[PDB]
CSV table of C-alpha atoms and ligand atoms in Angstrom, one decimal:
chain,number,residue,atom,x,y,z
A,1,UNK,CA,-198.7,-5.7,105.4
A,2,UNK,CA,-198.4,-8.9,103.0
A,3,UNK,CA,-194.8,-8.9,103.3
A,4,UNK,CA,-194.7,-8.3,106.8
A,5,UNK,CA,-196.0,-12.1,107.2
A,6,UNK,CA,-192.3,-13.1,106.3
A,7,UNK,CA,-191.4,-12.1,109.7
A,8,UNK,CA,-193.8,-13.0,111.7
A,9,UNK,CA,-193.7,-16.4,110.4
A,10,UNK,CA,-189.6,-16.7,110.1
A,11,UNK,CA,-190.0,-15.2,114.2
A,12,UNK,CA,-192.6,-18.0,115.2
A,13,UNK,CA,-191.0,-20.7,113.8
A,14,UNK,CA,-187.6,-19.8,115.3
A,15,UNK,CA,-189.1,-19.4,118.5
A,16,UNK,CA,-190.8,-23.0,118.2
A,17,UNK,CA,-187.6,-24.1,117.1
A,18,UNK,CA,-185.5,-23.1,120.1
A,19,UNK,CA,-188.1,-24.6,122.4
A,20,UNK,CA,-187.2,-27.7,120.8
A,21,UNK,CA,-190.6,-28.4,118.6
A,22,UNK,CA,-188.1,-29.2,115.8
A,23,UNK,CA,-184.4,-29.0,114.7
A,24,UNK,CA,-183.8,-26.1,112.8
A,25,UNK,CA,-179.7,-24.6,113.0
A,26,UNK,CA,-180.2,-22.6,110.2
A,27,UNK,CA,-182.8,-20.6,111.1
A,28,UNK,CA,-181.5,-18.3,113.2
A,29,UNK,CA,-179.5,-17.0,110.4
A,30,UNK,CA,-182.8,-15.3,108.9
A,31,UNK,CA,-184.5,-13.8,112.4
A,32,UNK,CA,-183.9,-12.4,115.7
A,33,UNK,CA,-185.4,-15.0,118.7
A,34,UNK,CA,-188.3,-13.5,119.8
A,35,UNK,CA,-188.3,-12.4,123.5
A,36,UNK,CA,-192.0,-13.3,124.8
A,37,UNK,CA,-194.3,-15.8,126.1
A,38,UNK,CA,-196.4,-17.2,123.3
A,39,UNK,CA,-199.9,-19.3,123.3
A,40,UNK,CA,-198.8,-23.0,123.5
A,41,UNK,CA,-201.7,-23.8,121.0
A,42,UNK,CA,-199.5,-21.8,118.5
A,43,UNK,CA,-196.3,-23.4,118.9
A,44,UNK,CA,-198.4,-26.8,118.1
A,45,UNK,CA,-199.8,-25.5,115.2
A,46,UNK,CA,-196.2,-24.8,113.8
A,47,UNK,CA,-195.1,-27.8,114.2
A,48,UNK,CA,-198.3,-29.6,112.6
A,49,UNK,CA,-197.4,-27.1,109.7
A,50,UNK,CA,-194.1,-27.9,109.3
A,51,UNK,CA,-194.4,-31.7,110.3
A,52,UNK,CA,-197.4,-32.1,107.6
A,53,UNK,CA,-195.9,-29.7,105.0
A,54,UNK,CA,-192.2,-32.2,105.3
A,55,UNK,CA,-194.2,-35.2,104.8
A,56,UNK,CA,-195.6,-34.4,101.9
A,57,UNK,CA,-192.3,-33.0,100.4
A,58,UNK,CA,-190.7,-36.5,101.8
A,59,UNK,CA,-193.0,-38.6,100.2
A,60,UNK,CA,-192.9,-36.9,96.6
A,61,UNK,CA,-189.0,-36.9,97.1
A,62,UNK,CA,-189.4,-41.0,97.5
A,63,UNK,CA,-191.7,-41.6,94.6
A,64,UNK,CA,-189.5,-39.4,92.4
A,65,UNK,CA,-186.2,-40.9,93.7
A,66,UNK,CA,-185.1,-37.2,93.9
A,67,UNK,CA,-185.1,-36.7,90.2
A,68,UNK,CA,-187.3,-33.8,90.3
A,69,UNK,CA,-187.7,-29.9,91.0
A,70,UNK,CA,-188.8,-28.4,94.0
A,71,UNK,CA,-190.9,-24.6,93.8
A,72,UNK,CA,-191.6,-22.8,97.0
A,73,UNK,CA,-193.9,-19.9,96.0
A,74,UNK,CA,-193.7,-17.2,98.8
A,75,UNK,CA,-190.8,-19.0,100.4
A,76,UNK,CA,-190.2,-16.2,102.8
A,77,UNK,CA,-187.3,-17.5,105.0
A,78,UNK,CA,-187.6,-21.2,105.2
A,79,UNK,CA,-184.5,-22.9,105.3
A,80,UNK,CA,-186.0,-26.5,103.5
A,81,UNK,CA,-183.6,-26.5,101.1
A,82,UNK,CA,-180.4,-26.7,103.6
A,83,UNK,CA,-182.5,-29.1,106.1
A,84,UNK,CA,-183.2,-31.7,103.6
A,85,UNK,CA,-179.5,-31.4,102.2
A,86,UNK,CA,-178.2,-32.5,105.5
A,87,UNK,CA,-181.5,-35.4,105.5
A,88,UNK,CA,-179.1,-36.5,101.9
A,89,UNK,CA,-182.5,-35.6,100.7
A,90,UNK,CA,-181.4,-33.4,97.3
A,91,UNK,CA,-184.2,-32.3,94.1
A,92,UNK,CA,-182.3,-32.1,91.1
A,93,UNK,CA,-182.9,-28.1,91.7
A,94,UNK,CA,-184.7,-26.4,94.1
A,95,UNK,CA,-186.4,-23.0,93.5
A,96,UNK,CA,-187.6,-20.0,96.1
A,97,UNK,CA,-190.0,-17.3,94.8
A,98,UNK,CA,-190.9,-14.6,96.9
A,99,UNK,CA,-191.3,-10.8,96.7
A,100,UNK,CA,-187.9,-8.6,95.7
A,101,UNK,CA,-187.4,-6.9,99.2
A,102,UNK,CA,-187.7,-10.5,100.6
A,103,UNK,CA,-184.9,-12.1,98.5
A,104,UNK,CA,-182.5,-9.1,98.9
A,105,UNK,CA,-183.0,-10.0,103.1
A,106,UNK,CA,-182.4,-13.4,102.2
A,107,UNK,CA,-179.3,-13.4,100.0
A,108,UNK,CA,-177.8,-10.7,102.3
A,109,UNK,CA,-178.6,-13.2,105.4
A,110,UNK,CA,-176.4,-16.2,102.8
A,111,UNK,CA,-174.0,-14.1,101.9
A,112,UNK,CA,-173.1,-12.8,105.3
A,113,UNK,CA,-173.0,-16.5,107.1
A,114,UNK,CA,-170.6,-19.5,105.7
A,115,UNK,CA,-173.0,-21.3,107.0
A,116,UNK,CA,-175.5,-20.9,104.5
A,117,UNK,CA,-173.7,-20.1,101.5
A,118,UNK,CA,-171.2,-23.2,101.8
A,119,UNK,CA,-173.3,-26.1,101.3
A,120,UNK,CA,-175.1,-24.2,98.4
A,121,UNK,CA,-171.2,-23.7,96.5
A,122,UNK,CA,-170.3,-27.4,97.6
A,123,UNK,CA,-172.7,-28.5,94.9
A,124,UNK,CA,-172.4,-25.8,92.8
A,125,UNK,CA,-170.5,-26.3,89.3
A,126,UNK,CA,-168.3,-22.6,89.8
A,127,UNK,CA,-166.3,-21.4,92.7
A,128,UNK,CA,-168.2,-18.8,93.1
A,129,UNK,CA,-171.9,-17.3,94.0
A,130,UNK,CA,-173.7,-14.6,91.3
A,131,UNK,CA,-176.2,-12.7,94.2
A,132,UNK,CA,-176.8,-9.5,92.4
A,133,UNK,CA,-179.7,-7.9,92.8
A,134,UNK,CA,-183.2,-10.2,93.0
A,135,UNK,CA,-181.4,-13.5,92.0
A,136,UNK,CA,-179.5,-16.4,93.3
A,137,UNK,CA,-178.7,-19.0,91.1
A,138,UNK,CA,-176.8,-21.9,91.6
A,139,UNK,CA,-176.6,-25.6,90.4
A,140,UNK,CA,-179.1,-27.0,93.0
A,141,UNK,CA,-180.4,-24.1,94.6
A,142,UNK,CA,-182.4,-20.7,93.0
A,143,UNK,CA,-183.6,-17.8,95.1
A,144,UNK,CA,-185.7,-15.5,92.7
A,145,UNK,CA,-187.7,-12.1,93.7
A,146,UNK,CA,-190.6,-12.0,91.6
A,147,UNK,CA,-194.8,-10.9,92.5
A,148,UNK,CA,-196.7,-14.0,92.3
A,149,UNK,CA,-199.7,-11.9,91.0
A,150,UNK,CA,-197.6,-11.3,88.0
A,151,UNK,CA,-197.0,-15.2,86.0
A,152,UNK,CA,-194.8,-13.7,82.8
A,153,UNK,CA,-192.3,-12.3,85.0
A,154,UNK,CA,-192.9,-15.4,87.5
A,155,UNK,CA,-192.0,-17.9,84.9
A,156,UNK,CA,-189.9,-15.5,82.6
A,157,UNK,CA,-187.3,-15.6,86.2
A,158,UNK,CA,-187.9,-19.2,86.8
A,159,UNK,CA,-186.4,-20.6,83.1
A,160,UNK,CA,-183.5,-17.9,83.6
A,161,UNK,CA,-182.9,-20.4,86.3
A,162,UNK,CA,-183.1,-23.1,83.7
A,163,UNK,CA,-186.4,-24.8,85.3
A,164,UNK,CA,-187.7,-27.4,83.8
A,165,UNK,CA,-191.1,-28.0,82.7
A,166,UNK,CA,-189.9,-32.1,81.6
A,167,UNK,CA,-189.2,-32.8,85.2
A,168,UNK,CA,-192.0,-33.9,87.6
A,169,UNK,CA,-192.6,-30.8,89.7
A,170,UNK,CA,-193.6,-29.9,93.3
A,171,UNK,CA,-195.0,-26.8,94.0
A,172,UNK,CA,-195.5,-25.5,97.9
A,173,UNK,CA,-198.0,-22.7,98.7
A,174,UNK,CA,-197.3,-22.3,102.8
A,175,UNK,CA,-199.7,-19.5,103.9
A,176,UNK,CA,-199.2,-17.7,100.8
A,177,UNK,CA,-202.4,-17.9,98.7
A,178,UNK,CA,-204.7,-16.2,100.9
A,179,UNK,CA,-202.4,-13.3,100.8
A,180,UNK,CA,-203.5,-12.5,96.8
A,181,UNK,CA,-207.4,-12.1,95.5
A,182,UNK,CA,-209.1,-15.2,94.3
A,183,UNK,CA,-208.8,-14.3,90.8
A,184,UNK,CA,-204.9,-14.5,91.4
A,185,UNK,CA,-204.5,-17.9,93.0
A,186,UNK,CA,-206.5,-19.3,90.7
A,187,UNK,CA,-204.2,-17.8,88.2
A,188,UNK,CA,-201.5,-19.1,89.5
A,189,UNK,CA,-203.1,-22.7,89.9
A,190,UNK,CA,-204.2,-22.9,86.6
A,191,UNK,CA,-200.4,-21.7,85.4
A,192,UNK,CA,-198.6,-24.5,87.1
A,193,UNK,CA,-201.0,-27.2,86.0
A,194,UNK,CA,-200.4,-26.2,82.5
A,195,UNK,CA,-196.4,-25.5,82.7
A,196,UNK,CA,-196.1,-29.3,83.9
A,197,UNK,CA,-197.3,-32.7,82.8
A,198,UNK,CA,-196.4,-34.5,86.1
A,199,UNK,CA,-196.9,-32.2,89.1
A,200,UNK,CA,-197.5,-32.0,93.0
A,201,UNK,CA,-198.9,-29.0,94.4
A,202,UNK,CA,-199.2,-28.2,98.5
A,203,UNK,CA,-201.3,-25.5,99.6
A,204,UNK,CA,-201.2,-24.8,103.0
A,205,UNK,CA,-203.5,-21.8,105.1
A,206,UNK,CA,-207.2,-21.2,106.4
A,207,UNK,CA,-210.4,-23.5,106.8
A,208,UNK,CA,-213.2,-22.9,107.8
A,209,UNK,CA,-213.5,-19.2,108.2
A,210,UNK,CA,-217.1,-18.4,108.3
A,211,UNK,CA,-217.6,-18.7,111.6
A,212,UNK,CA,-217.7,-16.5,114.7
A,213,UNK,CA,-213.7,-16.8,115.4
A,214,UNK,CA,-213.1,-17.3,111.3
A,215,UNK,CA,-214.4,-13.6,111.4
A,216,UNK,CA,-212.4,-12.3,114.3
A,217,UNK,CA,-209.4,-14.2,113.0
A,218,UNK,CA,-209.6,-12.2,109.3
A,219,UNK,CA,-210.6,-8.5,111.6
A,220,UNK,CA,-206.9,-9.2,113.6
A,221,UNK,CA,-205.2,-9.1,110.6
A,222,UNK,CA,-207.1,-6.8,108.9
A,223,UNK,CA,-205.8,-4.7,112.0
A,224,UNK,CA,-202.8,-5.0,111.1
A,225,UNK,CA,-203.3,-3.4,107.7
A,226,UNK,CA,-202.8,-7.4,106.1
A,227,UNK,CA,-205.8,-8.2,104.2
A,228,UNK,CA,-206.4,-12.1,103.6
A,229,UNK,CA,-207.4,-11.0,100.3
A,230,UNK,CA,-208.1,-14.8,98.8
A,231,UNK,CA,-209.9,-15.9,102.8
A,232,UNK,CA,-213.4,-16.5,100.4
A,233,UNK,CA,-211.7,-19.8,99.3
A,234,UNK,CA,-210.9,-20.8,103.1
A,235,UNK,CA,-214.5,-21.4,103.4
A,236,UNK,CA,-214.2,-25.0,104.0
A,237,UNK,CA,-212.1,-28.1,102.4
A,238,UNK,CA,-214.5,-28.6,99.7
A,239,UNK,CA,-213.5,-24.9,98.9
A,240,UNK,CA,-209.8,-25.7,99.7
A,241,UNK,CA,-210.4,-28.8,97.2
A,242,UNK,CA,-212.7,-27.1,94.1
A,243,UNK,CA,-210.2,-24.3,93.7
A,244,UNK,CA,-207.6,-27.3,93.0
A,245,UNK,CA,-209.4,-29.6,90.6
A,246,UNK,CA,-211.6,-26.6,88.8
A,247,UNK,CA,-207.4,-25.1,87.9
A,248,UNK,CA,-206.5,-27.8,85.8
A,249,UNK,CA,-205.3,-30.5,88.6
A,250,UNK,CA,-206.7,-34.3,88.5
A,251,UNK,CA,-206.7,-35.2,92.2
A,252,UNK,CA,-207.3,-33.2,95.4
A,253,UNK,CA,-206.7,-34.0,99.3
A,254,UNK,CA,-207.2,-31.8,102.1
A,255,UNK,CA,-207.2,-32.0,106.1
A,256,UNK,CA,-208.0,-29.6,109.0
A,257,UNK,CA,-205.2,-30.0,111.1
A,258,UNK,CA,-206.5,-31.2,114.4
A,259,UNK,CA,-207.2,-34.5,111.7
A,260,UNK,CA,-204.0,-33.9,110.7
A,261,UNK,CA,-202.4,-33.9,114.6
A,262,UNK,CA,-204.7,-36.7,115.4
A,263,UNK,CA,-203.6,-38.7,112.8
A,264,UNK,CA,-199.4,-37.9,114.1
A,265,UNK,CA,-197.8,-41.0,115.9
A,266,UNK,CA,-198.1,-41.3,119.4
A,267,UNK,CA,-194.5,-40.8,119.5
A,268,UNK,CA,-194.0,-37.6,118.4
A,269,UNK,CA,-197.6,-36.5,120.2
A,270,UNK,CA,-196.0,-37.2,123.3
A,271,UNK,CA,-192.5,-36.0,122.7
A,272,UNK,CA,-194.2,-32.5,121.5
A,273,UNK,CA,-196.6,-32.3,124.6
A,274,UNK,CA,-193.6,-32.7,127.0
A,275,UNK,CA,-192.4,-28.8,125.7
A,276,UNK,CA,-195.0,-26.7,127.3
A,277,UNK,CA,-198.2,-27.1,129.5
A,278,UNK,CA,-201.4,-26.5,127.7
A,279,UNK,CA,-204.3,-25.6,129.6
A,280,UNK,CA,-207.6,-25.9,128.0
A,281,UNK,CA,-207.2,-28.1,124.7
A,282,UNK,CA,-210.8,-26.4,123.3
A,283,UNK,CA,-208.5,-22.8,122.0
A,284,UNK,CA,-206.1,-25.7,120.1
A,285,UNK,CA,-209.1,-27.6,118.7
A,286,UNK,CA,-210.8,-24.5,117.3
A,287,UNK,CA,-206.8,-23.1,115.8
A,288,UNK,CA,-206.4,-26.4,114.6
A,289,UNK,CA,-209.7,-26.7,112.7
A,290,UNK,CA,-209.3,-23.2,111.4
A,291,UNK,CA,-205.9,-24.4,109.1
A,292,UNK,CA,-206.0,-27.1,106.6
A,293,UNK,CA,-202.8,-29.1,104.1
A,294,UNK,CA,-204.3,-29.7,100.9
A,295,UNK,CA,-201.9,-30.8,98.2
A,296,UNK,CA,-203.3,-31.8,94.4
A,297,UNK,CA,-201.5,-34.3,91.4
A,298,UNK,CA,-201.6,-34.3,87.7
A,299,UNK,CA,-200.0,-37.2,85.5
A,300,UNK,CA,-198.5,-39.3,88.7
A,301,UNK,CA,-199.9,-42.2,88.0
A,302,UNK,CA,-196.7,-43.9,87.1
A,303,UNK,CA,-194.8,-42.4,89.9
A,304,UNK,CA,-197.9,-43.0,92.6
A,305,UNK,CA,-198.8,-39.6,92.8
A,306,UNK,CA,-201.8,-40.1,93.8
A,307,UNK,CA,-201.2,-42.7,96.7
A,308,UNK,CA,-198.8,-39.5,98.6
A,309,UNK,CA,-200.4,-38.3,102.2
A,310,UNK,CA,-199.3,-36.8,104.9
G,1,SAH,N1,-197.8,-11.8,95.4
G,1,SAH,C1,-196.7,-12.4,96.0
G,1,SAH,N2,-195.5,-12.6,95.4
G,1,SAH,C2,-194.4,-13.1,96.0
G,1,SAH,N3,-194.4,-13.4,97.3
G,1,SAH,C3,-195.5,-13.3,98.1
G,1,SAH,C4,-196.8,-12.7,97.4
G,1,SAH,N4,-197.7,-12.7,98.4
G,1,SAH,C5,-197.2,-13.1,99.5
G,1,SAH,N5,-195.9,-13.5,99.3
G,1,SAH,C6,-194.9,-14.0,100.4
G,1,SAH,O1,-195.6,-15.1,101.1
G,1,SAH,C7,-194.9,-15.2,102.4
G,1,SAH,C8,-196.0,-15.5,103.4
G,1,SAH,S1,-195.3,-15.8,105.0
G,1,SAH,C9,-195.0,-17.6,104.8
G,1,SAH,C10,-193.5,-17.8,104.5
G,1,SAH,C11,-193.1,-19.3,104.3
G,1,SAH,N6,-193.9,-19.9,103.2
G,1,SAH,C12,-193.3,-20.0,105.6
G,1,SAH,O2,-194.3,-20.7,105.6
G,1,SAH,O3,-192.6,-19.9,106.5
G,1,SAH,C13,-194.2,-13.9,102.6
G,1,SAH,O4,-192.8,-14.1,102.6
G,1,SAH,C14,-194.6,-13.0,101.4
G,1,SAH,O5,-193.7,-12.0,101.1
C-alpha cells in the first residue's frame, strides 16, 4: 500500500500539471495522464504543496548561494532536481531516497528518455551513466533505493554517494513520514539532526486529524490497505512542531495550508482560480486545514536559517 502512494501522487500532480496549475515537461516521463474528472479542491491543494514545498527549497538555495546538498526522503517521482536545473538553480549534489522497487521505475523511466538522462551527463564528470541495480550516481544528481525505517543502510547508500555531512543540508519529507510508525520518524529526525551541523528540514503531510473528516480521511486509506502508520503526530501543528524540536532541531515553523494559500500573492490566486470552477469553497477550507508545511533549522544562524518561510 505504502508504495502505491508513488503513483497516485506522480498521477495527481501530472494531471494538475497538464491543466496548467504549474509547468512540469518532465513529468510525464514518470506517469501515464490520468483520464478522469477530479475534485478542483484537490488540484489546489497540489499546487499549494508544490508552490509552498519550492519556496522553501528556493529560499535555502538563496541563503546557501547553492553551495549545499539537497535530500529528498521518499522522493517518489518528482522531477525537482531537472526543474530547478533549467531555474540555473543547482545544489552542489542532489540526493533521492526512496524504496528499491521505486528507484528501479525511476532509473528505467531516465534511462529510456534523453530527456532525462542528458541534463544529468551534461554535468556529469564521465561520459557515461552507472544505473545498475538500486543506484544512480552522478556528479550532481544521486538516485538511491533504500527503506527509510532502516538509517545504517540509509546513510551507509548515501556516503557511497559521497554526501557530505560538512555541507549545510536540506532535507525534504513530502507526504512521506506519516507513512512509517512514530517511533520511525522520530528516528529518522533525530538521525539527520545529528549527521549535520547546519541543516533545513521540510516535512510536508496531515494536520489536524482528530476530527470527524481527520477520521474518515485515515478509514479511506486504510481502505485501501495504506495505513498512515505515523497520522498520531498529525494531531495538530504543535504536534507537527514538538516532533521537530524534541529530535534534535533548534527552530520549528509550521502552517495549515489554507494559511498557507491565504498568505499566496493575489497574482498567482487569481491566475490558479481561472483553471477550474469551484463550487462550494467550505470542502477546500476543511482539505486545506487538514495538510500543513513545517520545515525546522539547526546551526543557520550565519546563513539566516532561521529568517527562511514560505
Ligand atoms: N520507509 C520508506 N523508505 C523509503 N521510501 C518510502 C518509505 N515510506 C514511504 N516511502 C516513499 O514515500 C513516497 C510517498 S508519495 C510522495 C512522493 C513525493 N515525495 C511527492 O511528494 O510527490 C512513496 O514514493 C514511497 O515509496
Amino acid at each position: 500500500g505504502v508504495r502505491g502512494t508513488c503513483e497516485d501522487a506522480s498521477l495527481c500532480k501530472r494531471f494538475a500539471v497538464s491543466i496548467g496549475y504549474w509547468h512540469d515537461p518532465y513529468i510525464q516521463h514518470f506517469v501515464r495522464l490520468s483520464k478522469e474528472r477530479k475534485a478542483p479542491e484537490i488540484n489546489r491543494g497540489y499546487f499549494a504543496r508544490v508552490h509552498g514545498v519550492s519556496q522553501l527549497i528556493k529560499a535555502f538555495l538563496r541563503k546557501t548561494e547553492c553551495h549545499c546538498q539537497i535530500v529528498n526522503l521518499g522522493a517518489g517521482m518528482d522531477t525537482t532536481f531537472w526543474r530547478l536545473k533549467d531555474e540555473d538553480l543547482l545544489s552542489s549534489k542532489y540526493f533521492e531516497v526512496d524504496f528499491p522497487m521505486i528507484v528501479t521505475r525511476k532509473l528505467h523511466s531516465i534511462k529510456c528518455k534523453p530527456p532525462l538522462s542528458s541534463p544529468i551527463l551534461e554535468l556529469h564528470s564521465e561520459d557515461t551513466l552507472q544505473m545498475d541495480g538500486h543506484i544512480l550516481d552522478s556528479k550532481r544528481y544521486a538516485v538511491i533505493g533504500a527503506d527509510l525505517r532502516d538509517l545504517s543502510e540509509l546513510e551507509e547508500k548515501l556516503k557511497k554517494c559521497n554526501m557530505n555531512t560538512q555541507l549545510p543540508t536540506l532535507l525534504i519529507a513530502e507526504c512521506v513520514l506519516v507513512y512509517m510508525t512514530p517511533e520511525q520518524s522520530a528516528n529518522l529526525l533525530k538521525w539527520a539532526a545529528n549527521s549535520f551541523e547546519r541543516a533545513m528540514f521540510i516535512n510536508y503531510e496531515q494536520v489536524n486529524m482528530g476530527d470527524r473528516f481527520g477520521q474518515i480521511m485515515i478509514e479511506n486509506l486504510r481502505r485501501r490497505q495504506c495505513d498512515l502508520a505515523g497520522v498520531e503526530t498529525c494531531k495538530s501543528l504543535e504536534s507537527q512542531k514538538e516532533r521537530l524540536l524534541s529530535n534534535g532541531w533548534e527552530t520549528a515553523s509550521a502552517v495549515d495550508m489554507m494559511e498557507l494559500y491565504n498568505r499566496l500573492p493575489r497574482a498567482e490566486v487569481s491566475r490558479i482560480e481561472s483553471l477550474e470552477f469551484l463550487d462550494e469553497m467550505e470542502l477546500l477550507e476543511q482539505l486545506m486545514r487538514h495538510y500543513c508545511l513545517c520545515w525546522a533549522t539547526k546551526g543557520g544562524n550565519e546563513l539566516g536559517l532561521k529568517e527562511i518561510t514560505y
